[PDB]
Design a protein around this ligand. Structure first.
Ligand SMILES: [Ca+2]
Ligand SMILES: [Ca+2]
Ligand SMILES: [Ca+2]
Length: 593
């Protein structure tokens, strides 16, 4: 009841509420994949969301744009390559790094994450199960995250493009990330080696798009042998800012946040200045929709199996899924990532030979400005000189000096595949990427001081002399401070545009953790911590850029701890610094054209 379209219907409304909006196909579960097309259906959960909040890909599907000829790598916990709704799309070259074989299928029943990821991207278009976002894309799986994987550098390289088997993928799906309580540098040998690989693979003629989950730490993370979350008084700032995983600021990664079926940020989604776009991840599939996708086959394996019940109605279900080959509980930025990988494969199938940067440009300029009125999250405190200040800790939607709308929650906005394809038709390639040399400032004197609940930020500046249009900016920062989450770290462009690189009250509570279990503190502060902002996309680079750091808190905070080994619950107390912090150095790298 949804016919094929040609290229060439005049008067075609490609939008989210068009009368032409429908998905072709005979996949029995596709009408409960709200992420393909959101009609307010419940995804087998207790209730539906709001119609239109989806990837707006229906016109791609109707015109036969389906991911044909695009190779997607799923680097994850496994991939059941024989799955009845995946096998047709599996091409040769998967590697099981636990067994040595070509078959990354898991043998552990809980290891269903990568198979669920794969279905969102490329479940086969046929008369069973679901329909993938890009149902003619071809998959490989590399099970780097199986419980018994050693997660060896050699295998990460193999899976992310540095072997014969994987080099000719044009999309790398990384539904994974790191949570931390102490800051990390991005300069380790292993990290820089992967960054060199991602640079090579992105910028070459057959260029590959790396896609990366922002994290699911808005409220809780697991790190250091614990599950941690804040409790008590406090602003609604993410516990995990998306700039914390050092990998998320490497530029080559397109980092995505998760959106739910109501058209707002998924409760758990990490956010920050480095989010490029928002894509569909849902909630939990219990009370509200999550991602209907391919499960490990059988009722003894996967997220849909007898031993791991769910209130999602697809799971118990002899009528709709008698061999428990599908599930309704897949979620997370882990799901926003394949939603993005799928969108990217659709674009690449229509316009092969546009660069990754051009595809980013199209995705950014075509994104939907969802949740347009969400407010900034403010931090109020009495400053050191007696004045109450109320400053942004996280922005809402803001328009930069070049006219581009951006938010740390949604990036440039929710993916709109149909509109990206409309823009692509007459898109002129961007000029080649220019990566300006790093500019490092070594800060000295009384300008280094960061006062407790400062009345003004501590500022340090550097002038970019080169005319350039900005795409992204990277910063590295070094400072001393005895209670890191008190710090708000911002970057200001020559136009006066601001971007919060690190929101305060994040998960960097490890100094307090160390005091409690060791009796001393290992972390003095940030050391070459990398952050990235997309806020400045389109702006002129020439002029003075300003790093501004403020300590915005002198009150005590409590953090709840759950010991992962011993389910014992304890309480961590962050006590105020009581010696002023110190900026040591920072570096700026402008990436543009
Ligand atoms: Ca199917
Ligand atoms: Ca199953
Ligand atoms: Ca403080």
């Amino acid at each position: 009841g949804c016919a094929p379209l040609t290229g060439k219907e005049s008067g075609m409304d490609i939008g989210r509420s068009s009368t032409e909006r429908c998905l072709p196909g005979a996949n029995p579960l596709q009408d409960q994949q709200w992420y393909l097309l959101n009609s307010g259906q419940d995804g087998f959960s207790a209730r539906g969301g709001i119609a239109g909040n989806d990837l707006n890909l229906w016109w791609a599907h109707r015109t036969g744009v389906l991911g044909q000829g695009v190779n997607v790598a799923v680097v994850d916990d496994g991939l059941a390559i024989a799955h009845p709704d995946l096998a047709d799309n599996v091409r040769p070259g998967s590697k099981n790094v636990v067994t040595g074989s070509d078959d990354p299928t898991p043998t552990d029943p809980d290891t269903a994450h990568g198979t669920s990821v794969s279905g969102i991207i490329a479940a086969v278009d046929n008369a069973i199960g679901t329909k993938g976002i890009a149902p003619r894309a071809q998959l490989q799986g590399f099970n780097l995250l199986d419980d018994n994987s050693q997660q060896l550098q050699k295998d990460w390289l193999y899976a992310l493009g540095d072997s014969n088997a994987s080099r000719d993928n044009r999309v790398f799906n990384q539904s994974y990330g790191m949570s931390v309580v102490d800051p990390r540098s991005a300069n380790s040998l292993d990290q820089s080696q992967l960054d060199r690989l991602f640079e090579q693979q992105t910028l070459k003629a057959q260029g590959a798009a790396y896609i990366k989950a922002a994290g699911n730490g808005f409220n809780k993370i697991a790190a250091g042998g614990y599950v941690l979350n804040r409790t008590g008084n406090g602003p609604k700032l993410p516990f995990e800012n998306s700039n914390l995983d050092p990998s998320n600021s490497n530029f080559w990664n397109l980092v995505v946040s998760a959106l739910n079926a109501d058209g707002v940020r998924s409760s758990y989604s990490s956010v920050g200045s480095n989010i490029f776009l928002s894509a569909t991840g849902g909630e939990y599939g219990t009370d509200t929709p999550a991602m209907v996708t391919t499960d490990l086959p059988g009722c003894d394996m996967g997220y849909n199996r007898t031993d791991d019940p769910s209130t999602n109605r697809l799971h118990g279900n002899s009528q709709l899924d008698a061999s428990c080959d599908y599930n309704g509980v897949m979620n997370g930025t882990s799901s926003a990532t394949p939603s993005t990988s799928g969108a990217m494969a659709l674009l690449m199938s229509a316009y092969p030979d546009l660069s990754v940067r051009d595809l980013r440009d199209l995705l950014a300029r075509s994104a939907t400005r969802v949740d347009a009125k969400h407010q900034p999250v403010m931090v109020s405190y009495t400053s050191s000189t007696g004045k109450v200040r109320d400053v942004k800790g996280l922005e809402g939607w803001e328009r930069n000096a070049a006219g581009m709308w951006f938010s740390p929650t949604y990036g440039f906005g929710l993916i709109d595949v149909n509109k990206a394809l409309e823009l692509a038709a007459n898109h002129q390639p961007l000029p080649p990427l220019v990566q300006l040399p790093w500019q490092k400032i070594n800060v000295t004197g009384s300008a280094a001081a960061i006062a407790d609940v400062g009345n003004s930020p501590t500022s340090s500046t550097t002038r970019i002399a080169t005319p350039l249009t900005v795409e992204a900016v990277q910063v590295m920062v070094s400072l001393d401070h005895q209670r890191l989450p008190d710090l708000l770290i911002e970057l200001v462009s020559p136009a006066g545009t601001r971007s919060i690189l690190l929101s305060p009250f994040n998960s960097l509570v490890g100094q307090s953790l160390d005091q409690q279990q060791l009796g001393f503190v290992r972390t003095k502060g940030l050391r070459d911590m990398r952050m990235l902002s997309n806020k400045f996309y389109g702006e002129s680079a020439q002029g003075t850029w300003r790093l501004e750091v403020t300590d915005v808190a002198n009150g005590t905070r409590q953090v709840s701890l759950l010991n992962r080994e011993t389910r014992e619950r304890t309480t961590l107390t962050e006590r105020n610094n009581r010696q002023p912090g110190k900026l040591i150095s920072w570096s700026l790298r402008v990436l543009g054209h």
